[PDB]
Amino acid sequence: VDWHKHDSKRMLHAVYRVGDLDRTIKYYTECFGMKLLRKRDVPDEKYTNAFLGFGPENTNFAVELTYNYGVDKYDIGTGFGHFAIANDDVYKLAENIKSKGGKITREPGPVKGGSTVIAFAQDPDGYMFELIQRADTPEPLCQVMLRVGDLERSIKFYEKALGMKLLRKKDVPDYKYTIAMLGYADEDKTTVLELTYNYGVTEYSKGNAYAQVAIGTNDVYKSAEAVDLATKELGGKILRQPGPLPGINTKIASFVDPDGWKVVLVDNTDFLKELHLEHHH
Ligand code: NA
Ligand code: NI
């Protein structure tokens, strides 16, 4: 209810799995112009994380790659849409991606109409990146797009569970889809969650590739209460109850939305503590 007004939430990162960490890092840095921000090896649990993006994690959204030792392939499934990168010259960007050995699946040009210039690139594991031409972006990693079976239900869920704003809604009956942009700030200044409904399609597979999106909150207990209240009316479920993780002590909670997409809430202060320990110690 009123807690969302008092909280200061932020989209932190999308977490997903990759077959070859160095290869992805090279593709993102050379083709997409990302920076490698942080890398954490966790050999006791046979994984390595790498965080990449266009600005420091304390002010920007990132991608969090997970490499499970020896595991070289995953199943993306049908529900996962794409990540989007906004850039002021998509023709040049798509040419860069090709010249670095990357793959363009949809050549640069205006969309449906037109006239926004877009392109699509495909990464080594198969994840799609929409390239969107925007003149002066403050946050290039600008969308995570997921498919959903009931858009109204989802919009209400992200509003009530997570305090997101419905930023934009666009129905395109000519092509049998509707989209919504959800987030914590104006669409052109932030990373949005784009939810896509295809007419008469109510289920998709979650696969095992995409893991979750992480959202920072000033109180995981209060935010998890809000989520639990939402899930009672609309669907989804708390998975990990709010509390500190052993050792590091970062407070988190996790849940699934009405479609099965996974969200992790992270205590904002604890997240900054994590970043600090990596970078300054
Ligand atoms: Na599309
Ligand atoms: Ni210190």
UniProtKB/TrEMBL annotation:
<keyword id="KW-0479">Metal-binding</keyword>
<dbReference type="InterPro" id="IPR037523">
    <property type="entry name" value="VOC_core"/>
</dbReference>
<feature type="domain" description="VOC">
    <location>
        <begin position="140"/>
        <end position="268"/>
    </location>
</feature>
<feature type="domain" description="VOC">
    <location>
        <begin position="10"/>
        <end position="134"/>
    </location>
</feature>
<dbReference type="GO" id="GO:0046872">
    <property type="term" value="F:metal ion binding"/>
</dbReference>
<dbReference type="InterPro" id="IPR004360">
    <property type="entry name" value="Glyas_Fos-R_dOase_dom"/>
</dbReference>
<feature type="binding site">
    <location>
        <position position="112"/>
    </location>
    <ligand>
        <name>glutathione</name>
    </ligand>
</feature>
<feature type="binding site">
    <location>
        <position position="82"/>
    </location>
    <ligand>
        <name>Zn(2+)</name>
    </ligand>
</feature>
<feature type="binding site">
    <location>
        <position position="177"/>
    </location>
    <ligand>
        <name>glutathione</name>
    </ligand>
</feature>
<dbReference type="InterPro" id="IPR018146">
    <property type="entry name" value="Glyoxalase_1_CS"/>
</dbReference>
<dbReference type="GO" id="GO:0019243">
    <property type="term" value="P:methylglyoxal catabolic process to D-lactate via S-lactoyl-glutathione"/>
</dbReference>
<comment type="function">
    <text>Catalyzes the conversion of hemimercaptal, formed from methylglyoxal and glutathione, to S-lactoylglutathione.</text>
</comment>
<dbReference type="InterPro" id="IPR004361">
    <property type="entry name" value="Glyoxalase_1"/>
</dbReference>
<feature type="binding site">
    <location>
        <position position="106"/>
    </location>
    <ligand>
        <name>glutathione</name>
    </ligand>
</feature>
<comment type="pathway">
    <text>Secondary metabolite metabolism; methylglyoxal degradation; (R)-lactate from methylglyoxal: step 1/2.</text>
</comment>
<dbReference type="InterPro" id="IPR029068">
    <property type="entry name" value="Glyas_Bleomycin-R_OHBP_Dase"/>
</dbReference>
<feature type="active site" description="Proton donor/acceptor">
    <location>
        <position position="130"/>
    </location>
</feature>
<comment type="similarity">
    <text>Belongs to the glyoxalase I family.</text>
</comment>
<keyword id="KW-0677">Repeat</keyword>
<feature type="binding site">
    <location>
        <position position="130"/>
    </location>
    <ligand>
        <name>Zn(2+)</name>
    </ligand>
</feature>
<dbReference type="GO" id="GO:0004462">
    <property type="term" value="F:lactoylglutathione lyase activity"/>
</dbReference>
<feature type="binding site">
    <location>
        <position position="64"/>
    </location>
    <ligand>
        <name>Zn(2+)</name>
    </ligand>
</feature>
<keyword id="KW-0456">Lyase</keyword>
<keyword id="KW-0862">Zinc</keyword>
<dbReference type="Pfam" id="PF00903">
    <property type="entry name" value="Glyoxalase"/>
</dbReference>
<feature type="binding site">
    <location>
        <position position="147"/>
    </location>
    <ligand>
        <name>glutathione</name>
    </ligand>
</feature>
<feature type="binding site">
    <location>
        <position position="198"/>
    </location>
    <ligand>
        <name>glutathione</name>
    </ligand>
</feature>
<protein>
    <recommendedName>
        <fullName>Lactoylglutathione lyase</fullName>
        <ecNumber>4.4.1.5</ecNumber>
    </recommendedName>
</protein>
